[PDB]
Design a protein around this ligand. Structure first.
Ligand SMILES: Nc1ncnc2c1ncn2[C@@H]1O[C@H](COP(=O)(O)OP(=O)(O)O)[C@@H](O)[C@H]1O
Ligand SMILES: Nc1ncnc2c1ncn2[C@@H]1O[C@H](COP(=O)(O)OP(=O)(O)O)[C@@H](O)[C@H]1O
Ligand SMILES: Nc1ncnc2c1ncn2[C@@H]1O[C@H](COP(=O)(O)OP(=O)(O)O)[C@@H](O)[C@H]1O
Lengths: 27, 71, 171, 439, 292, 447, 426, 66
């Protein structure tokens, strides 16, 4: 399972598979 | 020039006669430089003068004591 | 000396974003992409200065940099608008009272707008281009750092470098 | 209007030698006039340089001060073209602190033989439609990805290798960028953002000039021709990662073993057709500056099959060879003077001194009356040619100050009273003999 | 950090104009060509081009050719790398560093440390650039946009640090007149679209030809007398019925008879026999009633 | 039916002694009148015939000869003839007497580097190597952590093996950025590694990748092979004094720094002598003493002449050829003292002198003909006779120098060959050293 | 035959300054002849060097060119033997670009005086017969000599050493017990099958050996200069050693002498071609020859009354009187026909050539008409002419051939004056 | 080792700015060269322009020569 980064005409995207922490906690 | 098939082989391609080898520099090591125990124990000024040397670091103007007092 | 007595005057825009960081708000899309658990479209960063406050919306890739730098809310930071890189300056002076001692120098709140722009005219001799090319700076390599611990000395700059500099300033 | 780094200087009007197809000199052409004898000889040695067959040929140009010795050298340097190496040195420039005299001359020789390498590689050149980078949730670090590229006619998708992905991510390419990828080298390069998509964007990460999308076939070939002197090949090979010494000049006394090794490898490339060797020229101006140790090096240095053609100029009578007691012709020892052909130059007349001034005013953008040229030509024989040439700008400026539009004879008489010739200066220095220092 | 503060935060004195601040003798950042400013300003970055870890030659023209219409276009001054192959010198001898032996347990403990490298900090400093960069480098496997490496790890010479030299596959061309000739023939004929048979008289040579067909990626298929009878059937039936296979490799005594290779536009003999008729058969097993 | 030919690589450049091919002696030791590019100088060629035997004998050290005679007589042509006569494998070391003035190292030591460079050595080196596609790679960890081993799996067309290797080699593999699927070579004597690329098997795995691909190695994964290495004593001396072998951080970084020369000390040369004598005793090595040629010897400093008194009396030093073209000059560095050939009497007593002497008109014509057909140009007999006369009026160097310029004029006006009128024209464009010295003496008020 | 590095050179035949036990110089021995007075005097100085009690003493060997004044010094360096330091330099070799002129002399003195010590070592030597290891680790091995056997249990650091060096049964090895270094000497003859071969050692396996070792006083100084000072003892980078370090080391070696922990071995400095030191360098030797740790120094010279370098002053030998009062002068004399003939015989024996008694006669006359070194050079050349001729013994016509090919300086000078204006710069 | 000229120029500019701001003040001192008679002719010709800057010391020099 792989964390995935995308950039395109529709704008940028970062993506995490389910169960991965997705460590972008708010501050 | 100094059988027919040897001439034919060389004319077709010289790799058929002798294959080119991977060259690499000549590698060498000397015998290691021997130091006696006597010189390794009693001979380095770094060691036998360590008590005297400490004074030259005590009387330094770069001790943080002296910097604060100067500054 | 013959190359000191010739000058260039060259002019360029600078743009930068700066302020105390009030929030980091990673923003999710309503649905993830297929098979994924969550997806982030952007980060919101809220910056404030003596003139006001506003949100900046940024690419998700910023978030890695914001943990390489030890950024936390109440720091003041800047972003170079031509490059996208972010740098910490320190905790805002507002918080200087929150302990009797702390091992960080506090920095005053930025004044003027969150987003800044100016045009500047910068002037240099050809001799300055000669030297800056003949001995580079901004080392992150053994050649640079060794070269910068060693005692600097002038060197016989080659006629090739003078040639190449002449070629590019003409362009 | 706009001023470039190169301007009007002392020899800017010369553009060749003005020889015809039968190698005879025209009276006035390509900005050179008179001097028929030496211009013929310069034609013959230029022809020999272009042929390239024979090594170590040497020529000395001689004659009075101010008679076009340096001018003929610049003349042939123009005619020989940019594609063939031509090196200038004044004789003073070999007295280095960093390396010995024989090293300095060896470098000046090896800097004057070119190795010319044509190179072709295949490139992909397109507008980035998208990038996917996939990273492991813990793992070993074996990142994988896909990228898509567009042109006005075609678009396609590439499955990306693990050595290549680090380059895209290092240089932070993103959708909307136009890029050129060199397949063989694995290097990315960027032209700029395409005009369209930057409207649909976040708060700014870049602010720069846009560029148009590429057209037609997405994959195309590129060609470059590199000319590299033997000297820079010696420097590159003197140590690992030594490239900065090509600009810095820091590389001292290169090992002989390196040059021997390069001389062999260059010959192999020639026979393989991988590179072309191209002999050029070394011009040493004011050559009488060299010590006899330098002359003695030249004797035997000139005898190698890698030697370039050598040209020298001098303005010296029988004089003592620098660093010794001995008098000799041109201040060069006979050991060396025997090894070369001498071309000699002649003083000018009215007819050609006036013609030199005429071709000079055409270059400095000046108009003068025929009366003014008549006076100036007399000044240019009463006193040296360079002085007369030097009055032309001063006359134009004094004219322009008084809102004139053509230099008149009284402008020249004005300037002539204001800026001295050496002979007049030296005369006034007699009447204040006690007031100047150290007579 | 000093550059940002010094270059935007400039207006008015902090004190009713008294006192120098901390850091106020550090003037070197103010210069227009300082690394911070030259990083901050996108355009001066282009006038300081000589970086310490690239083989930059200077500026040149470049030309690009489309495959369609053979139309070219010219690019003016751009930076150039030197070509890869100019790096070619090597020492004749490579001695191992001289070392000391002393017959004492403590002395032997000391010299072991020196051969491993003096301390983890000092070794990391040279090898990875800083101990901070060493700590990051271990986990850079897990970052999308990692920062540069700083150590000896940051430098990569074109040949590696070793001096050993392996004869490259191009040496097949450099060393024989016959392959030098064959290469220009085949590159021409490939561009013209012509299909070809190559006949050769030594199995040892057909091996060298196969190494060439793999290196310049032509596609190929070979039928020595050592091939099994069943292979010959497939291999002939694949040289007909397809556009794909550019060249067939044959020895005349094995493949010169019966074979009906009407798909070939051209025939090359890399060598010839003391007896004619063999070659006549080898040619006329392409040149026959099926061709147009 | 149709016939075609191709060859376009430009042939080697002609230079000042490229006509010389050897001494051209006969078997009895006498000199032929004209052979292998030389003519004349019979006593000096016969004398060089003795010296090529003195070299090939291998018996001697520190014997030295001086070629002496007026400028333009053929001194360096003879020394170049000897370099042909010994063949390529004997080291011949050319040098000019103004090269001793280095800025890095003392003059007295530059001489020693050149002497040690003129003695060659030939060695049967045995190297043992591992090569293959790396199919597996695993380190083995241990306590005070450390690395105990790396385990490597290698694959070749013959099969596979698995090896256990020192952590030094793992450190090297890491540095070379090696991974599984790469093809590598390791030489176990040196500890060195080379990456070649990925194996061809994987070459289609990506549409776009930076790598080059190589075919799988043939032969056994482990093998040992003999390389015949040619080297000089100097090359051993210097490679030990600033080392770059092995794979430690120290030697690796010593490959990056600016390569300064250094005064190699007598203790190192001493230890290298002992090592090479022990290579000879084991029958691994052959010694080939060669020749050092020091042209323009008349401008070594008197410090250097007084050093050669010691270096020529060494039991090791090779055979030396000096050359000079001077009369009773002052000796450099003394300002007061004059002596023959510019060399001190004290050194001139330790050498054998070979006299070299001026050419007759017939010899000049003969050399000019030889040289013209070397430069590849055709000349008519009456033209060549005219050049012969110019030789007697000036110098043979100038007479030879007119050849190529004349040929350019000939082709410009459509002639295939030099006619007399071409030489007669070129003679007036370019002055010689005497005719130019005249005009410059008449107008001596103006230079 | 195979070739040494040390082929035949100009003094190779001298194998000792040959004398009887009363220091009487016999008429020809150990490859050298004549020079009765000089060789006796050289013998007395060789006895001073060997006895060693007196420091800071010097002798000047002086006389015309080609009178054996390097020869006697070269013979003396053989006769003194190894294991007593002797250092030889040309006077032109001290003019370094990297190091001061007075440093190079200071260093040259200290290469030539040695400190000597003896120390004891526990050593194992034997054939290995079995070696065993397990999955910390404990293993065991057995060793053999011709005379005994043992088994040993191995501690951890030896297991690392033995496993590192891949020791196998039948190897013959030596072990520095105290340090864990393994030396391997090949394989036993009885397991030479299935590499170098040797017989197994005699005596016991573990020997307490005693080793005598000696280091130049310079080599102490350099090791102390830097993190790994000993490399500068090869690379030559030993730039200007700080005098306060040398001050310290002399006091340390003085106490090692008095406490008996080491003993000092004096030596010789042979500074050749002395007439070309500067007056600055003489002025340093003036006062360097007064230390308790000065060697004996021997100086050679061939110069008449001459201007001393770096000045306008004139003095004997090209050396100032200031330095000549420190030393004794031994004077060589030119040879007679007998001596000249005999020296030529000795060179013929060293070069392996034979010649007729008349050939020796004419060559002797040449030797007197043109100085010895010319005649000695004719010998090798003559033999090469004979070999080309398929002769054997050198005859008079082979000598007269070579005398016409290769000139001496006096004839070459005469044949230069007839073409005076063709040479440069006279 | 030979401070680059553009550095000393930059410092002079900065010190002049601080005295206008009042952040700093300049104290002129003295340079004394005893036995000045053995300065060299090139060094004397440098003093001819050293004694002309907006910020230079006073020089005192002493000499014993006729
Ligand atoms: N024949 C000529 N044709 C054109 N310009 C000439 C000619 N001779 C000299 N000049 C010009 O006159 C000036 C003096 O010539 P210059 O080359 O400096 O003389 P020199 O090197 O012989 O002392 C230069 O400005 C040069 O361009
Ligand atoms: N005997 C000869 N036979 C053939 N060419 C000769 C002969 N002597 C001299 N040369 C040639 O004539 C020129 C002068 O000889 P060179 O060796 O340069 O003389 P020098 O003794 O002054 O160094 C060179 O081109 C050389 O090759
Ligand atoms: N007594 C001798 N025995 C042997 N060789 C001698 C003798 N005297 C002189 N020689 C020879 O003379 C040469 C050394 O000359 P020498 O006088 O020692 O040198 P220098 O003149 O430089 O002082 C050598 O060839 C040496 O063999």
């Amino acid at each position: 399972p792989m964390v995935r980064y995308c950039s395109g005409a529709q704008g940028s995207t970062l993506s995490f598979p389910p169960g991965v922490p997705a460590p972008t906690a708010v501050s | 020039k100094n059988l027919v098939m040897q001439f034919r082989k060389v004319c077709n391609h010289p790799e058929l006669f002798e294959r080119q080898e991977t060259w690499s520099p000549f590698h060498i090591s000397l015998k290691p430089y021997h130091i006696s125990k006597f010189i390794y124990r009693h001979g380095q000024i770094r060691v036998f003068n360590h008590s005297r040397d400490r004074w030259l670091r005590v009387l330094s103007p770069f001790a943080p004591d002296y910097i604060q007092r100067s500054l | 000396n013959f190359r000191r007595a010739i000058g260039l005057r060259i002019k360029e825009t600078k743009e930068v974003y700066e302020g105390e960081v009030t929030e980091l708000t990673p923003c999710e899309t309503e649905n993830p992409m297929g098979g994924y658990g969550k997806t982030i479209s952007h980060v919101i960063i809220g910056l404030k200065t003596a003139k006001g406050t506003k949100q900046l919306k940024l690419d998700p890739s910023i978030f890695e940099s914001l943990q390489k730098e030890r950024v936390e809310a109440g720091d003041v930071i800047y972003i170079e608008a031509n490059s996208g890189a972010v740098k910490r300056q320190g905790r805002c002076d507002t918080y200087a009272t929150e302990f009797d001692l702390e091992a960080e120098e506090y920095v005053p709140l930025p004044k003027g707008d969150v987003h800044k722009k100016k045009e500047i005219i910068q002037d240099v001799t050809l001799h300055d281009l000669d030297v800056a090319n003949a001995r580079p700076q901004g080392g992150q390599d053994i050649l640079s750092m060794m070269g910068q611990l060693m005692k600097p000395k002038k060197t016989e700059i080659t006629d090739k470098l003078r040639g190449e500099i002449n070629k590019v300033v003409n362009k | 209007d706009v001023t470039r780094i190169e301007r009007i200087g002392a020899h800017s009007h010369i553009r060749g030698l003005g020889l015809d197809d039968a190698l005879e000199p025209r009276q006035a052409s390509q900005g050179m006039v008179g001097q028929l004898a030496a211009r013929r000889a310069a034609g013959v040695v230029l022809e020999m340089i272009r042929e390239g067959k024979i090594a170590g040929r040497a020529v000395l140009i001689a004659g009075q001060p101010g008679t076009g010795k340096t001018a003929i050298a610049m003349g042939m340097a123009q005619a020989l073209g940019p594609d063939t190496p031509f090196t200038a040195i004044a004789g003073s420039e070999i007295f280095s602190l960093e390396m010995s005299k024989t090293e300095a001359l060896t470098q000046a020789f090896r800097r004057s033989i070119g190795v010319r390498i044509k190179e072709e590689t295949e490139i992909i050149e397109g507008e980035v439609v998208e990038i996917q980078i996939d990273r492991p949730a813990t793992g070993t670090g074996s990142k994988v990805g896909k990228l898509t590229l567009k042109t006005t006619e075609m678009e396609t998708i590439y499955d990306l290798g693990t050595k290549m992905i680090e380059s895209l991510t290092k240089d932070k390419v993103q959708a909307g960028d136009v890029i050129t990828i060199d397949k063989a080298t694995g290097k990315i390069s960027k032209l700029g953002r395409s005009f369209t998509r930057a409207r649909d964007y976040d708060a700014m990460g870049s602010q720069t000039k846009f560029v148009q999308c590429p057209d037609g076939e997405l994959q195309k070939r590129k060609e470059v021709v590199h000319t590299v002197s033997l000297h820079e090949i010696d420097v590159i090979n003197s140590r690992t990662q030594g490239f900065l010494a090509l600009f810095s000049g820091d590389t001292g006394e290169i090992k002989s073993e390196v040059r021997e090794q390069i001389n062999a490898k260059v010959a192999e490339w020639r026979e393989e057709g991988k590179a072309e060797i191209i002999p050029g020229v070394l011009f040493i101006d004011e050559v009488h500056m060299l010590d006899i140790e330098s002359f003695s090096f030249l004797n035997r240095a000139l005898e190698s099959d890698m030697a370039p053609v050598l040209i020298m100029a001098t303005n010296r009578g029988i004089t003592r060879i620098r660093g010794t007691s001995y008098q000799s012709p041109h201040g060069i020892p006979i050991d060396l003077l025997d090894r070369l052909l001498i071309v000699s130059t002649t003083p000018y007349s009215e007819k050609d001194t006036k013609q030199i001034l005429r071709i000079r005013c055409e270059e400095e953008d000046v108009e003068m009356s025929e009366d003014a040229y008549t006076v100036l030509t007399r000044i240019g024989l009463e006193t040296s040619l360079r002085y007369a040439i030097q009055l032309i700008t001063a006359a134009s400026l004094v004219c322009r100050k008084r809102k004139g539009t053509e230099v008149q004879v009284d402008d020249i008489k004005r300037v002539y009273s204001l800026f001295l010739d050496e002979s007049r200066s030296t005369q006034y220095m007699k009447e204040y003999q006690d007031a100047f220092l150290f007579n | 950090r000093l550059h940002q503060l010094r270059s935007w935060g400039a207006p008015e004195g902090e004190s009713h104009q008294r006192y120098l601040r901390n850091k106020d003798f550090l003037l070197g950042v103010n210069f227009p060509l300082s690394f911070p400013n030259l990083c901050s300003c996108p355009l001066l970055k282009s006038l300081v081009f000589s970086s310490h870890c690239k083989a930059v030659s200077g500026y040149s023209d470049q030309v690009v050719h489309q495959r369609r219409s053979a139309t070219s276009s010219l690019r003016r001054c751009l930076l150039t790398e030197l070509p890869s192959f100019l790096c070619v010198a090597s020492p004749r001898v490579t001695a191992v560093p001289l070392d000391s032996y002393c017959n004492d347990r403590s002395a032997e403990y000391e010299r072991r440390v020196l051969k491993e490298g003096g301390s983890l900090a000092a070794k990391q400093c040279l090898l990875n650039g800083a101990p901070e960069l060493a700590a990051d480098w271990l986990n850079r496997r897990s970052q999308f946009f990692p920062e540069p490496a700083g150590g000896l790890w940051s430098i990569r010479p074109q040949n590696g640090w070793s001096f050993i030299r392996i004869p490259g596959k191009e040496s097949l061309i450099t060393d024989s007149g016959k392959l030098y000739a064959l290469d220009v023939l085949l590159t021409r004929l490939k561009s013209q679209g012509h299909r070809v048979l190559i006949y050769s008289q030594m199995t040892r040579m057909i091996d060298l030809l196969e190494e060439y067909m793999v290196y310049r990626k032509h596609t190929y298929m070979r039928l020595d007398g050592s091939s099994k009878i069943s292979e010959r059937r497939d291999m002939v039936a694949d040289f007909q019925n397809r556009n794909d296979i550019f060249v067939f490799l044959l020895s005349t005594r094995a493949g010169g008879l019966g074979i009906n290779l009407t798909a070939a536009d051209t025939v090359i003999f890399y060598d010839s026999d003391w007896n004619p008729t063999v070659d006549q058969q080898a040619m006329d097993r392409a040149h026959r009633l099926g061709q147009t | 039916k149709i016939e075609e030919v191709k060859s376009t690589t430009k042939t080697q450049r002609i230079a000042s002694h490229s006509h010389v091919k050897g001494l051209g002696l006969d078997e009895s030791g006498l000199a032929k009148q004209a052979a292998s590019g030389l003519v004349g100088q019979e006593n000096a060629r016969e004398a060089c015939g003795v010296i090529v035997e003195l070299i090939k004998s291998k018996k001697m050290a520190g014997r030295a000869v001086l070629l002496a005679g007026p400028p333009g007589t053929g001194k360096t042509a003879l020394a170049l003839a000897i370099a042909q006569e010994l063949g390529s494998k004997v080291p011949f070391c050319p040098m000019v007497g103004s090269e001793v003035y280095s800025t890095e190292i003392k003059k007295t030591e530059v001489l020693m580097e050149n002497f040690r460079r003129a003695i060659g050595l030939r060695i049967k080196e045995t190297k043992e190597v591992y090569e293959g596609e790396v199919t597996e790679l695993t380190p083995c960890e241990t306590e005070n952590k450390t690395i105990s081993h790396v385990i490597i799996g290698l694959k070749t067309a013959k099969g596979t093996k698995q090896l256990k290797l020192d952590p030094s080699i793992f450190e090297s593999l890491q540095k070379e950025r090696v991974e599984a699927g790469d093809v590598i070579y390791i030489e176990a004597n040196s500890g060195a590694v080379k990456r070649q690329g990925r194996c061809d098997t994987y070459a289609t795995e990506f549409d776009l990748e930076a790598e080059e691909y190589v075919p799988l190695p043939k032969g056994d994964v482990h093998k040992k092979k003999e390389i015949i290495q040619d080297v000089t004593l100097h090359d051993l001396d210097v490679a030990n004094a600033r080392p770059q072998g092995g794979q430690d951080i120290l030697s690796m970084m010593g490959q990056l720094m600016k390569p300064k020369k250094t005064e190699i000390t007598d203790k190192l040369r001493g230890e290298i002598n002992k090592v090479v004598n022990k290579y000879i005793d084991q029958g691994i090595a052959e010694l080939v003493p060669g020749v050092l040629f020091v042209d323009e010897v008349h401008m070594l400093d008197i410090e250097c002449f007084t050093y050669l008194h010691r270096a020529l009396e060494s039991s090791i030093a090779p055979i030396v050829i000096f050359a000079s073209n001077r009369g009773n000059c002052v000796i450099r560095g003394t300002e007061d003292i004059t002596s023959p050939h510019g060399i001190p009497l004290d050194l001139l007593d330790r050498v054998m002198i070979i006299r070299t002497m001026l050419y007759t008109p017939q010899e000049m014509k003969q050399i000019i003909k030889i040289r013209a057909q070397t430069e590849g140009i055709n000349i008519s007999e009456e033209a060549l006779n005219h050049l012969g006369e110019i030789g007697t009026k000036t110098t043979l160097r100038y007479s030879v120098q007119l050849l190529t310029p004349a040929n350019l004029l000939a082709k410009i006006n459509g002639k295939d060959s030099i006619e007399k009128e071409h030489v007669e024209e070129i003679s007036e464009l370019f002055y010689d050293a005497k005719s130019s010295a005249k005009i410059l003496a008449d107008q001596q008020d103006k230079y």
